[PDB]
Amino acid sequence: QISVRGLAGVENVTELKKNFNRHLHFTLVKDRNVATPRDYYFALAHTVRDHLVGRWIRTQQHYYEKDPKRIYYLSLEFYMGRTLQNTMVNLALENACDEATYQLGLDMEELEEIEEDAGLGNGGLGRLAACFLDSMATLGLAAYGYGIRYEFGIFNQKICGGWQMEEADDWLRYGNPWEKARPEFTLPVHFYGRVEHTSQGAKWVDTQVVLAMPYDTPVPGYRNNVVNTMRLWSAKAPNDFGYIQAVLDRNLAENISRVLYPFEGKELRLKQEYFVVAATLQDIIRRFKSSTNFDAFPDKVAIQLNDTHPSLAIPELMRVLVDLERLDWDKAWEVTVKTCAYTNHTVLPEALERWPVHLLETLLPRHLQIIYEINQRFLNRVAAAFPGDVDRLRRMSLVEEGAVKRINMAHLCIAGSHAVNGVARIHSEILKKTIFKDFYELEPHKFQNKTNGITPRRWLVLCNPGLAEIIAERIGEEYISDLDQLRKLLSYVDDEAFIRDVAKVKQENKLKFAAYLEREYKVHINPNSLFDVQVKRIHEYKRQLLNCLHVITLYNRIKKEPNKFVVPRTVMIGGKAAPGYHMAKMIIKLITAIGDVVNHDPVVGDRLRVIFLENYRVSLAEKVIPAADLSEQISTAGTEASGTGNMKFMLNGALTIGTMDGANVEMAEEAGEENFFIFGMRVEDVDRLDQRGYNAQEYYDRIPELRQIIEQLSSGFFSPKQPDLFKDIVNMLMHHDRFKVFADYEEYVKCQERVSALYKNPREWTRMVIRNIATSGKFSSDRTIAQYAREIWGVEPSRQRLPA
Amino acid sequence: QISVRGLAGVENVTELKKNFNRHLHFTLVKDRNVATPRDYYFALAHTVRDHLVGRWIRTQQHYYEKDPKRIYYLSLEFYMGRTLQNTMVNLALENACDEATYQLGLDMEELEEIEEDAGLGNGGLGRLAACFLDSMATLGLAAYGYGIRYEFGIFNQKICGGWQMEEADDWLRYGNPWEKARPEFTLPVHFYGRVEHTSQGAKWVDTQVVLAMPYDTPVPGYRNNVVNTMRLWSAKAPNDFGYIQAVLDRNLAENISRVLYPFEGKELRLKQEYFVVAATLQDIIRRFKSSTNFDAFPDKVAIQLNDTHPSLAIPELMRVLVDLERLDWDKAWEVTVKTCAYTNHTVLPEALERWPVHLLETLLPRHLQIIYEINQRFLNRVAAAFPGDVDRLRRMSLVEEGAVKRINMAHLCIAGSHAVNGVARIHSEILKKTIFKDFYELEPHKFQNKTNGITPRRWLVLCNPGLAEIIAERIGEEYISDLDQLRKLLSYVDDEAFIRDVAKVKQENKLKFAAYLEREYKVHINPNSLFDVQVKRIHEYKRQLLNCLHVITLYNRIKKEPNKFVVPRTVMIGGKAAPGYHMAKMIIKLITAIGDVVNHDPVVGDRLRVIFLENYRVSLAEKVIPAADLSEQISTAGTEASGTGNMKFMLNGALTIGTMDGANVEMAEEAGEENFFIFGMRVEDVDRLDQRGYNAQEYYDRIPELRQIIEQLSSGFFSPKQPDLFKDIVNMLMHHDRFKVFADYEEYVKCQERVSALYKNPREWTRMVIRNIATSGKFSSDRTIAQYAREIWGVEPSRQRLPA
Numbered sequence A, B: 001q002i003s004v005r006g007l008a009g010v011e012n013v014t015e016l017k018k019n020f021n022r023h024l025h026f027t028l029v030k031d032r033n034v035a036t037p038r039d040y041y042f043a044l045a046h047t048v049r050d051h052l053v054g055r056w057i058r059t060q061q062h063y064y065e066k067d068p069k070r071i072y073y074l075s076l077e078f079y080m081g082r083t084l085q086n087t088m089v090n091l092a093l094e095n096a097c098d099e100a101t102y103q104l105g106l107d108m109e110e111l112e113e114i115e116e117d118a119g120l121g122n123g124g125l126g127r128l129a130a131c132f133l134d135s136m137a138t139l140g141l142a143a144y145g146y147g148i149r150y151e152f153g154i155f156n157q158k159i160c161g162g163w164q165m166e167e168a169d170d171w172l173r174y175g176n177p178w179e180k181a182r183p184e185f186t187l188p189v190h191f192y193g194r195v196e197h198t199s200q201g202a203k204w205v206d207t208q209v210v211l212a213m214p215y216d217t218p219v220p221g222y223r224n225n226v227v228n229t230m231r232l233w234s235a236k237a238p239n240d241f242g243y244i245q246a247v248l249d250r251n252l253a254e255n256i257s258r259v260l261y262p263f264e265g266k267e268l269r270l271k272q273e274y275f276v277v278a279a280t281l282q283d284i285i286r287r288f289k290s291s292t293n294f295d296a297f298p299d300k301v302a303i304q305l306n307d308t309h310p311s312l313a314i315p316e317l318m319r320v321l322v323d324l325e326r327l328d329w330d331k332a333w334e335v336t337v338k339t340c341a342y343t344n345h346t347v348l349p350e351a352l353e354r355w356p357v358h359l360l361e362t363l364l365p366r367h368l369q370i371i372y373e374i375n376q377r378f379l380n381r382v383a384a385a386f387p388g389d390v391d392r393l394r395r396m397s398l399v400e401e402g403a404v405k406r407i408n409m410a411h412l413c414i415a416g417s418h419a420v421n422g423v424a425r426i427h428s429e430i431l432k433k434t435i436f437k438d439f440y441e442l443e444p445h446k447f448q449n450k451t452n453g454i455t456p457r458r459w460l461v462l463c464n465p466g467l468a469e470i471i472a473e474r475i476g477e478e479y480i481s482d483l484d485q486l487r488k489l490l491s492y493v494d495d496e497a498f499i500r501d502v503a504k505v506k507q508e509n510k511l512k513f514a515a516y517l518e519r520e521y522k523v524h525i526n527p528n529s530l531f532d533v534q535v536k537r538i539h540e541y542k543r544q545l546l547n548c549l550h551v552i553t554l555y556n557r558i559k560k561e562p563n564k565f566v567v568p569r570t571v572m573i574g575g576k577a578a579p580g581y582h583m584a585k586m587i588i589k590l591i592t593a594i595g596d597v598v599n600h601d602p603v604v605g606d607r608l609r610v611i612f613l614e615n616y617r618v619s620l621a622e623k624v625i626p627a628a629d630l631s632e633q634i635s636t637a638g639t640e641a642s643g644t645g646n647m648k649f650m651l652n653g654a655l656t657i658g659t660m661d662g663a664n665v666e667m668a669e670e671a672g673e674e675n676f677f678i679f680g681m682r683v684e685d686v687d688r689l690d691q692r693g694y695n696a697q698e699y700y701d702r703i704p705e706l707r708q709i710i711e712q713l714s715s716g717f718f719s720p721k722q723p724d725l726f727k728d729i730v731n732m733l734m735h736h737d738r739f740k741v742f743a744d745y746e747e748y749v750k751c752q753e754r755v756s757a758l759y760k761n762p763r764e765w766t767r768m769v770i771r772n773i774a775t776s777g778k779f780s781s782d783r784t785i786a787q788y789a790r791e792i793w794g795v796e797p798s799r800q801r802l803p804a
């Protein structure tokens, strides 16, 4: 249909049709009589997979020949979403498949909707890694994603009477046609045991052996015929493991790759972490030996560590080079530091892993020895650089004293890596000034920034084809792999035909999403209202509560002056809470409770709707973001390391209400502050407040509108049958608010009125939109990856094709 | 190469080659560079599978149209062996594939050897069901095998210092290309719960739901284009089943289809049994409704129950018809009796399932109620037929008193079935006279015989192509689906060219197997010796111990007169012992212990070898039976219900040494007693001995040669480092021998001398062989199945093709 999807020729369409029939017939073992839409989805998925694998074989063939420096991206989270459309777009098969399935009496869009989201990630970190794989392939890097094939992803979220219910994600129930099991490349991973010393170094012995089975998923670049590999590890018990009981207990080892953790210091967590690290490192070493001399290892291998999760890669690499390959400490260490780099994804104190010594002792005794020995040599470097600074010595130690003895894994990461980066400028500055100040003063050259990005493939071409077409009409298709080219849309801010087109696309997207809400969730929304959307994980730092306070203000204002005009709004909030995070679960209930009162008040009518979006995930993100008018990015300054949803919204025609936090600062810098709704405390202001002490009572005393809301919550206004249901929320807001919701309330409400004012003038809104879209180029993951490649890994990106 | 495999044409071979490459490329995701022989095996297996599925679809399509009476064969054992060659032969693809793989630089025979045996059965019962599926498809019956997809089969047997070690059978490690998972046809199976009564009948409530997932395996008929289905059930936990623990405990439900039991009254056993029954019955009912009126059910459905294992099918069918479909008792019962039939496979007291009431109460409360109610109505039938016979009432009851209360499942089987059969004439007679006398006197018309059979496809054409070719040269190919035609070989017993050919085939088979022993197991055997082979499960009734006593006699005779001529022999014994069957495990050790002494005695030389065959299984049976001269079938009279190995040997050119037990009686009747080495007690003689009382001491007192052997065993002759190792064996032989080994010793040794005498005259041996092969026609499973079809199920077999 459109230009951004490819050619629907004569030979391709005819050839696709007979491969569809072949897979339905031979692969699926069905005919037209018993074939359900799911079988049709599988037949198409298998047919498209055929074109991937041909390119996949050639790519790995190619890397064998050229022998380039290999990048290893290690994450415990790969938040992939659906694969079919992404695959069709990157291979230029979308129109051929659409025409081909049409000629068969099939709707392709109906088929796409049957694919389950890969349950392989939680949130930002996981989606980031997905965007990166896409970018890495698009830029011709010989890169590998490595992680765990969780049998059950992050839970599916169901709402029952306003409460989050968790239910298992059986995304694999019907099979995954994209993955290829590789049982022939299975690998031992060791646990417990003991250390023995011999005239010939240390030996790890009497170990429980868990086997690690790899599944491979192809990762297609954008129209460059490069197809990289994402390799995911599954746990499988060994074969010599009454007789019936020995076979049943094989389940115990296989529990490692069973569930993604929604930092909780459980053993199973540590085991997952070592599991992915150990198998991955064996694979990396094996691949390098098919190039003896580990001097060249850093020129052939780059390993990127994402948060403290794969931190054990450092002692593990040491263990292999020292105990097994017989290299001297100093040489092994030189190789480890040059190979590894460390990205920090968030400063949240409750996410920087600190393991108890008594646990590493039991589970990985040799690793503890290596850590102690790393710590010792590192501390002599500190001692010699800062003579007499004993407090620095204990601050910088990898070992923490007091209560239980712990190993700070972030400190390990810094010591054993040649580069350390944060994920947006302000965040990387914060690392340098606060939590890693000591390490920065010792090695200022390790510390870099790499502002996060999103892929324009999924996050524009795939999810918003309408917008993608009108851009291409004016400036052509080159922007898809070079998003900076969107600057050229600046010369169109005054063009009347373009203003109308941007506004029409937005309204089409809104109408569409409005109709999805009704069909699948029977809830009725006004499509000409302002689509006010906050979508991300539920957490107090993200301050869904601040949004809640605004929604109630608008409602109270409508009740006070009902016959006075207000810009209508649909307020949408979606996100999962962590299962044991009580406050987050209460917030969800608060939101749905506000909906119950507001959506059923006749005096309000269709002027305010509060909708909770159930089971927020990648594929729901692809539907809601194109339809949004207002992006809520309202974390307390200094808490959101970057964010990436914000970039998704910028790129899709939403204006942003936000604090100067994470990437917001750089988004506002790129579009100009005038084109951005910035409100609230900067980082400096939060610090000043922290010094004097935060007293929420003061805000309750001076702001009558806020006082009313607190009273309403306390007295059961939003919970008539359980008057004191939100007592924990009120009590937290009043006495124990770490994120200072009340302090940003006034300026947030004031900013919101300005958002409303501007929306009454559609023409000016849309011009402001154009200025955002036109300046979103910096936020491409192509740009991010290009920077990692040049400043960290030491490989040159490439835009060159591989033969078809 | 040969005529019995098909045409290797021009279009087929060319077309097979590009499908081989397609699966290697696209299915396997490999190229010539990384492709191991296993990948080549998988590429061929996938290519041949393509031709199956085309016929598979049409067959089920066909049955939908014609709507024939459907046969359901229920077994907890399906002992399938390898599938590739069987598949090639039945489709007539063997020569096309051989030529096709040759043109690619591949040896097909090398590839065949990479396929693992389906770990889905234990022994006779399991192999019987396999032969039957083959026969049912060959004879055009709309039949379905139903059972459990055990994740780990029967253990693999390893010998370590003469002892059986059990190790898990991970036959699925690399995947099974023959099966098709069907997640879309998953089914609930209920456990525990309670019964509630309502104005509207009984209700089963508060049940644990285990889900039952079906895997389908195609079952090709012989060159008739019929392809039936074998459906196997896998356990999978439900979706609403801290949060981490709820996901891990999903393993508990999935333990149902985890391991085949090597009758042990465990709960997990009962659960497996109910599991297969419940899901199977739901499937049967569903299929019948796509024909309201359950009067026609018996005309559309036949269910065959194999031993007491699927006995719960009877109360389960009642439960569905009464509680769910709302039929009256009497009508439901009429339907159940007409649908079900029961085969008994062995009279072994320790294999007739008797479950404790307290267990059925807990696990299946409604089923217990239905059983009690069945028992009540059945006992009124007994009371009215035999007025005043109270002991008959308690003998015939489904409920047993004393100690723990038990349900006799065999009694249930008889009451709720319209036919009951044994598996060889003598065995069916025994059922009528002894263990089911009471039931026979009440309903003489239920009781039938159906002598077991083997398939000539696997057990001649597949395993012995050499013999298959020389037969076809003289009489053509028609015998493969009509084995009675072997009678025509009678007119050849005096033909000189045929005598030589039979003898040459045998020697080729022997040379071949001799060379397999050396390569894979480095053990050196004389190929001109008499190949004396006893292969079957190790059990005292099978009397491997009697064979052992002969081997030691021969050895002692050689030591006494070393320079006297004896017909050289290789004595081969193979078989698995049940893990907790102590005596059987000791017997194995005894056999290997005899080997240690005998194979290393210089004075013996290559005149006697004792080899234990490790890990006896279907594919080893396919190698050893063609190579055998002497078939040991030496169970105590009245203990072997039929046997089937015996028929395998008869058909492959071995003479038989045996007791008049099971099918031996009918084999001797068909070939004439003169052409058979019958020895020992008949059934009548065992009875007479049982009456007087068995005193083994008496035989030890009168037979000096036997006395010597006992002394040797006791004094540590075969166990020098552990003198008293075989004390349990001696002690059992002497005081607690239930199978009367000593009583058959003299006549067994005497018979063995006659076997030896005849072997010195090769020409007469081979003529006697011809007379056996020529009369083995009755033992075809085609004949057996034809009889089940006509006398039990009420369907007419057919030899007609389906379109190609």
Ligand SMILES: OC[C@H]1NC[C@@H](O)[C@@H]1O
Pocket: A124, A125, A128, A344, A345, A346, A423, A452, A640, A641, A642, A643, A644, A662
């Ligand atoms: O770096 C991935 C994510 N970590 C926390 C967010 O601020 C950031 O986008």
Ligand SMILES: OC[C@H]1NC[C@@H](O)[C@@H]1O
Pocket: B124, B125, B128, B344, B345, B346, B423, B452, B640, B641, B642, B643, B644, B662
């Ligand atoms: O009927 C299957 C098997 N049960 C015991 C054996 O005698 C018989 O072949």
